[PDB]
Design a protein around this ligand. Structure first.
Ligand code: NA
Ligand code: NA
Ligand code: NA
Ligand code: NA
Lengths: 320, 321, 321, 320
């Protein structure tokens, strides 16, 4: 998995992710309308006040999102953080206690600004607790973004709860976010500008084509390598104008660091690959995605009809 | 540029390319119908006998293709081959003489099997002659494919004319094709299979995520590195079923090795990037494409209307750079 | 700099380092005998009780070691830790307070087991104090080893004081040690075993020579890359028998990751390179070393003469830079 | 294997090689004096006119050299060229026909200048013929050097006999020399100069230590990678003065690209590693070497005693 965000020139946000998995989770697009029942394990039950859209599954009427985005332009994506993620073994007195899966809707239902999320997370405790008996707790970390800033939320057995500002606009998987940030200093030799002809003791040594400035840029799917590549691409990609160009830019970057089917076989014998790429445009309230076996962009929208529906709106699962 | 071909389980061909350039050329999609006038610099002028589709420009009524594909399922793509490509000073008596730009139509008009193209090429001579004085001769090499085999055609100052079988189904830019083939032996350490946990003198060293067996796979846009990655992806991608799945597999692979805007600045100061990605599906006679600033797939078809049109059918030019 | 330790089949320790710098420091080999005066900034002044040998300079009669090893087979080496290393503003009541330069002698004089060093360090405080106003406080971290275990000591602004067990037997420079350890998981794809011939869609792709399983092993002098390579070599080098074979194995490994003159120019314009490589053999109490411009092994020994000398024994300084 | 040459400021040559093998060949240092019997398979038998030194084996009184150097400052080293090397299946009329193993002494006995070797090789045919019944033909290519130039001699089934000028002063193994030269253009992004701090969308990304300019320099033992690294090191290493400094420089470079024991296991189950590193100094007529298990430099010399001996002078085989 790779998460990505950036803005156009006028602060319109484009924010999304690749889902890179080794099995089928049965997910599909889900629109949660306003005034939908919203239970909490350790807080008063309530109802949604904001409509949200994203990809996920429905568990006894609870929309469990892999990524979701509210009508006000703030979203969150959950990505794998194995060997690090570890939540509290029980709620703590005086904290805002959330089972780790509840963070998706807690963030999208109560906030519109990342700066506010940041202040609220100072009294939040994430609890190691599953939705129900037949689910395990997923070892996730999260990227949260509005149009002004993105933060990384990580709760690990190594370091506890840490919240990072993410100026690169990217997130992958393990190890922890500061490790990845530190790793970038080893890639300062990268340069978009091509090299030119040289004399190696009088032997002409010259580029055969363009691209020689990025010698050393990794192209495999190791999380640290996708991180370096996605970060490099995102910060050097110019700002572009309009919905079509920005959506295209989003998919150009994430299809570049996609995990290609057949190139990764996990230790259990299964292919791991990017099953879908998705982008939320806050300006149009539109969720764009495509699939490993179906490349044309699909669109799903928060609008006056869907934001006010009486039930969840769920699209059949796209068969991988 | 990266060219790519493969087939599905029924022998349906999927064949196309990325165009990675640093300036605008005015190109767009062009259908050339049957019975369209076809001049030759050094051969008897004639008319097209098969319809073709692809990307290119029209120069004084002559469709000059970047890539093109005939209704019988054989296609060709021209890619840059700098510091190598060199053609004859003039025509040669006894040979089939073509200005190098004429090879696109000469191949798509006269053949349906790459086997026949291979035999005819033994008597072909490519000439260093431009279409007119406004254009320079482009230093190209070519990939040609039907459903059964793909070949690379390179005509160089170093080696003369060479024709290679291309079992990898990929082509990029310089150096020459046998150089790239030889390079693959240096990457036999790549493995789709993940590593597992190890004991480094009792220190547990274990992967953090999947992908560890492809350690060393280059991610940059140097032609050698795009060749290795593109070949590695193509040969390990499973054969898939149906038009939608195969077209998506094509774009999945070529977008993986696309040259991303902002990441490559040439020595003249211009961004080099993939301005379009195109796929020809021989089974539906459909040309698919999308662009750096417009990701939706656009489709264009050779069918009973377009193949018997009375003129060139030209779609508008999408601006870039 | 790269520090390295391992043992032979009998538990004889071989422990030393490369010094990779961009200027001359005047260093040379120094034997400090037993019963030599030993002042402390924040502790009762005393005398040495064990003889030590290593590389360093003498400042007003005080041997300031870059690395040093005591007659009981425990040693320590200081390596650069920039952008991390930070020590206390002043001493702290109740702690064993040391100016950071005093750690070399404090360790080699008071311990023979790394286990005891580990316990004492829980009450140690390192102070940001130079030896005098002519020298700046060096931003060091340390590797300490006996025959049984090696530890890394890092005192940083980011993390305070940390002590790590070092099963890899290696240390380089920044970032912090847990960062490097974590990095190793990304290199689980490395394999000493050669690849063999493969079929890439029927194209034979086969190694041209041995070594193909270590595809992706970095060859540059970035501290992260020297750490990965040095750890990989050390853990896969077989245990060897005898003094000559073990000393050679040591130099084989450290010369593999040496920083070669001319290949690294720092932002101030100076060449950074390995000016010397040194190995302490605990079994013979012998310090071996050679230099960038003099490859013969020079040897210096702690024995009954040098350990009971009446003064510091200093060998001449070999000029560099 | 890696071969290396360079000169000091006054044209004194330093020239040698690593031997990287997976088994023991029983080789040792051999001095061949003047007037020693020198048979040829396809030419008149003669005697040596120049003394030579180097590493090799003795086969029925014939010194079969892995590398050797004549008293006049010209040397040759044979290195592996598998899957390419292919010699003539029989002598050709009108050519100077040499069985491929005879080239070592033919070059060192008849020439002092590489420019002369170059002209003579135009009428030379290398023949696929073993020393005797119990030896196979080794698939070698060669590096030949005097103080002014080095050439690469390659006879392959792909390309026939080719002779290259070698301004890099290095040679490894397969593939062919022009392939390696072409490969350097892909590494033009390498720079000895360190990178400096950068702003990745306002995130400080800065080197943690020196060395960042050579991002992408390979450190494994694949022949193409040792070639790139050795070439880079040799052309950026400054010229140095005097015998000690130049011998040290030689070993610094070749120990850097050495094949370290335990890091390479071949498909038959054996470790491959650098068993010896050797350097001939033409100025002192001294052959320096050390070994994987014995690091102190050993020296062997062409002098008035050894150049005029009555038999071969052979040192017992160093046991690996
Ligand atoms: Na509740
Ligand atoms: Na004509
Ligand atoms: Na004191
Ligand atoms: Na004879």
């Amino acid at each position: 998995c790779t998460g990505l965000r950036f803005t156009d020139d006028q602060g319109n946000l484009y924010f999304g992710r690749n889902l890179d998995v080794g099995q089928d989770y049965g997910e599909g697009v889900i629109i949660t309308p306003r005034n939908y029942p919203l239970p909490y394990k350790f807080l008063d039950n309530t109802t949604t006040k904001k409509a949200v859209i994203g990809m996920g599954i429905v568990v006894d009427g609870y929309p469990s999102y892999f990524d979701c985005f509210n009508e006000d332009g703030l979203g969150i994506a959950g990505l794998n953080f194995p060997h690090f993620a570890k939540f509290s073994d029980g709620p703590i007195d005086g904290k805002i206690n959330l089972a780790s899966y509840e963070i998706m809707l807690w963030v999208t239902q109560n906030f519109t600004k990342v700066s506010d999320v940041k202040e609220a997370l100072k009294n939040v405790n994430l609890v190691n607790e599953a939705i129900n008996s037949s689910f395990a707790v997923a070892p996730l970390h999260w990227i949260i973004s509005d149009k002004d800033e993105a933060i990384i939320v990580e709760v690990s057995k190594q370091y506890g709860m840490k919240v990072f500002d993410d100026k690169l606009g990217v997130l992958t998987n393990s190890p922890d976010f500061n490790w990845h940030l530190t790793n970038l200093g080893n890639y300062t030799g990268l340069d978009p500008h091509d090299a030119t002809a040289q004399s190696w003791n009088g032997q002409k040594v010259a580029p055969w084509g363009v691209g020689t400035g990025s010698l050393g840029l990794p192209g495999d799917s190791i999380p640290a390598d996708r991180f370096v590549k996605a970060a490099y691409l995102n910060v050097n990609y110019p700002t572009v104008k309009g919905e079509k160009a920005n959506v295209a830019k989003f998919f150009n970057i994430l299809k570049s660091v996609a995990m290609i089917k057949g190139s990764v076989v996990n230790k259990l014998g299964s292919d791991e690959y990017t099953v879908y790429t998705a982008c939320y445009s806050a300006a149009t309230k539109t969720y764009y995605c495509n699939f490993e076996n179906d490349f044309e962009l699909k669109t799903y929208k928060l609008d006056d009809e869907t934001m006010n529906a009486d039930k969840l709106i769920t699209y059949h699962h796209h068969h991988h």
